[PDB]
Amino acid sequence: MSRTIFCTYLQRDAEGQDFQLYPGELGKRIYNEISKDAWAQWQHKQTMLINEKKLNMMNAEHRKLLEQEMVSFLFEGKDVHIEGYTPEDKK
Numbered sequence: 001m002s003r004t005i006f007c008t009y010l011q012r013d014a015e016g017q018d019f020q021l022y023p024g025e026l027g028k029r030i031y032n033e034i035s036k037d038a039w040a041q042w043q044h045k046q047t048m049l050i051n052e053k054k055l056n057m058m059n060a061e062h063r064k065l066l067e068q069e070m071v072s073f074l075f076e077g078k079d080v081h082i083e084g085y086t087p088e089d090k091k
Contacts, residue, residue: 008076009038034074042073061085 007014014035020027046069055062065085071078 005032005035007035007038008033009041009074010035014038030074038074042070045073046070 003016004013005016006012014037017031017034017036017039019031023030046066049069053062053065055065057063057066068078068080068082068084071080072082
């Protein structure tokens with residue numbers, strides 16, 4: 001059963017994502033806007049980025065990196081500046 005949705009990254013009819021295979025609230029909030037296509041696209045790119053950045057997910061620095069880029073690429077309409085690391089104390 002291919003459920004048709006409108007993916008932000010495609011701006012057209014797309015097939016909805018599968019189910020909660022790890023996330024929950026964020027998962028479904030993204031699944032309804034993101035097709036399997038875009039989901040695969042980004043996760044490939046970020047995996048590549050992680051190989052370049054050599055970052056670990058145990059640090060808020062690199063953890064918020066993932067968050068910034070992920071939301072900006074998939075959801076697009078984020079409120080956070082994509083500067084990677086924030087040199088300002090007040091965020």
